[PDB]
Design a protein around this nucleic acid. Structure first.
Ligand SMILES: [Ca+2]
Length: 615
DNA sequence: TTTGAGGAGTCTTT
DNA sequence: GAGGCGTG
DNA sequence: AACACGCCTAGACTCCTCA
């Protein structure tokens, strides 16, 4: 059915969301109408529309429209879309600000020239503010401007906002089940599909699992609209931060903070609050909380720490939203109090509560403890005996470090140019480990996914699979993912722990063969260079090691997926292996990194920090 | 008025 | 978040 | 030497802007 990828991927999105009664409740007749209208277009019409949907939202010169793969002459196609009410022509081009925007710098010249009142030179931005002030006061001459501006611009089209808004809202619904497609893409700006989805959705093959919904996420179409608002807000803030527009970003955040304070009482929330965590993250309240968290990053960037500390205390005062984020919060609270506000009394309480919170883990739990030792073992603190108070003396077991060198040129070395980690590999190759992978945490991740695939994608857990295109159970990064599969996991873990170096070889082979290619977030099909490499490796690691790593990734992927060693190296014959974090001249171990190395050692694995010093 | 660097916008695959 | 790499 | 920030994140290609 020869459809081009962008259209195929678009169509997968509409289908996947429309086949949900739950989700279709969230659209009015008028809205659904527009969807049908899409389906009523020719393929040519639809191809163009997707293209235009994927461009930036604003007018386009007819000259800057070319898709010979769509049509050698597009006027009919445009006409179609225009009758359909999907696109608008220069004829509806009425705003002036807009017409000027569409005109180039040299075209703003020819208009600043054929209009004596204008100063004929300046930046594109300059001439615009000008042309707008003149049309504002003496209104009649501003119409003659618009006329020639329009004639100068040429024939132009724009996507209609109303139809666009609908597809965007479908996209939003699609992208939730898919984390968010990307943490900015089907968030906003004015939302389209992620590059990865746009290009690949139409070709992707997803794991089989049984859809099974017993729970509404959104009350009504209103509720979704709210959620979509906040989403586009959170996107906007994020875009500011990313460009350096920190002040703008602040206005946005406060604007958002008050918006959220209006909704505080709204009935929809009582229900949201009631949803399981793996679903609650798809509500207004959660998005706003995420905004607030960005707010505190902006407050810190503008060195306004008393205020960051207020927002941080405020977040940490409620357990309904983002409980996983508490680690980051407590940690960040403590760092602000200790290092930016020098208030040590509150810095101690901070830490104390932080460590009592079962929702703080790994990295941020270690960081808080490590600040706690720094304090009660410091001259400028000896005025207290209130951190000698029962500290679970969490002594992360010490690890074998090592130092190699390389000639400096992300850090480039020479040997042909290479990375830091690639230079460490070459060391270990000549240290008798012929085999090695620079895979960081995905090496272990795909192994876990290989060994537990069928339990990952097990049936019998309501709401964790809500539609066709998932690549993980929605509860995957949650405390509950283990809880809800306890008996199966427990048994699978036990079983791997005891499996000889050939049952594992065969388990992996079984999944690889049944699942190869299937999109699943844990697994990277090219992470190993062939099935037999994965086999070679699982053989070296053996049962208890493998079993332990999987145990953590399943108990707490949310807080464990990060910090595994850059490298796994092994001797083909001796079957001996080492887990190696490569640290360049300019870095030391993150907290997560050290917790892991401790943990790997407890499972009886050779672990090693390899430092590189330049020459 | 010429030249050049950096920006913005678009596209990718079945 | 994730994690490296560079400055203060 | 210990601790913090800051910045970034795909890649290629084209046409546009502004100095
Ligand atoms: Ca490293």
């Amino acid at each position: 059915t020869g459809h081009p990828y962008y259209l195929r991927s678009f169509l997968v999105v509409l289908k996947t969301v429309l086949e949900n009664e739950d989700d279709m409740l969230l659209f009015d007749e008028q809205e659904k109408g527009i969807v049908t209208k899409f389906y009523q277009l020719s393929a040519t019409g639809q191809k163009l529309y997707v293209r235009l949907f994927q461009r930036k939202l604003s007018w386009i010169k007819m000259t800057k429209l070319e898709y010979e793969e769509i049509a050698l002459d597009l006027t009919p196609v445009i006409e179609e879309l225009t009758n359909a009410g999907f696109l608008q022509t220069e004829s509806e081009l009425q705003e002036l600000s807009e017409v000027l925007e569409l005109l180039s710098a040299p075209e703003l010249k020819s208009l600043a020239k054929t209009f004596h009142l204008a100063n004929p030179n300046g930046q594109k931005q300059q001439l615009v503010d000008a042309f707008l002030k003149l049309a504002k006061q003496r209104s009649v001459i501003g119409a003659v401007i618009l006329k020639r501006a329009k004639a100068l611009a040429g024939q132009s089209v724009r996507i209609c906002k109303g139809p666009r808004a609908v597809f965007s809202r479908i996209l939003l619904l699609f992208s939730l089940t898919d984390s968010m497609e990307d943490e900015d893409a089907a968030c906003g700006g004015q939302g389209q599909l992620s590059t990865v989805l746009l290009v690949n959705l139409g070709r992707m093959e997803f794991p089989s699992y049984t859809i099974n919904r017993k729970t509404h996420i959104f009350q009504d179409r209103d509720d979704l609209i709210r959620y979509a608002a906040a989403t586009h807000m959170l996107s906007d803030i994020s875009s500011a931060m990313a460009n350096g527009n920190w002040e703008e970003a602040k206005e946005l955040a406060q604007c958002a903070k008050r918006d959220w304070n209006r909704l505080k009482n709204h009935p929809s929330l009582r229900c949201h609050e009631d949803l399981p965590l793996f679903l609650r993250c798809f509500t207004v309240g959660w998005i706003y909380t995420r905004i607030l968290s960005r707010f505190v990053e902006i407050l810190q960037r503008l060195h306004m720490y008393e205020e960051a500390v207020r927002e941080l205390e405020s977040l940490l005062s409620q357990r309904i939203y983002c409980p996983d984020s508490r680690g980051r919060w407590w940690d960040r609270l403590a760092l602000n109090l200790h290092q930016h506000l020098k208030r040590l009394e509150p810095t101690i309480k901070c830490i104390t509560e932080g460590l009592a919170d079962p929702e703080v883990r790994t990295g941020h739990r270690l960081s808080l403890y490590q600040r706690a030792v720094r304090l009660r073992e410091s001259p400028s603190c000896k005025k207290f005996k209130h951190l000698f108070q029962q500290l679970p003396e969490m002594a992360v077991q010490d690890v074998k470090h090592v130092t190699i060198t390389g000639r400096l040129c992300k850090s480039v070395f020479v040997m042909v140019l290479c990375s830091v980690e690639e230079l460490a590999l070459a060391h270990y190759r000549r240290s008798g480990f012929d085999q090695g992978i620079h895979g960081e945490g995905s090496t272990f991740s795909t192994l876990y996914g290989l060994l537990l695939w069928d339990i990952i994608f097990m049936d019998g857990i309501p709401d964790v699979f809500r539609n066709a295109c998932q690549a993980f159970p929605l509860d995957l990064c949650t405390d509950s993912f283990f809880t809800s599969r306890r008996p199966a996991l427990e048994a699978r873990l036990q079983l791997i722990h005891d499996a000889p170096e050939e049952s594992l070889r065969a388990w992996v082979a079984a999944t690889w063969h049944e699942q190869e290619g299937r999109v699943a977030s844990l697994v990277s099909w090219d992470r190993f260079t062939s099935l037999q490499q994965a086999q070679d490796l699982v053989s070296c690691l053996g049962g208890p090691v493998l079993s332990g790593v999987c145990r953590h990734l399943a108990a707490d992927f949310r807080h464990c997926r990060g910090g595994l060693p850059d490298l796994v190296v092994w001797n083909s014959q001796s079957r001996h292996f080492k887990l190696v974090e490569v640290k360049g001249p300019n870095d030391r171990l993150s907290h997560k990194q050290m917790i892991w190395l401790a943990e790997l050692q407890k499972l009886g694995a050779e672990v090693e920090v390899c430092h590189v010093v330049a020459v």
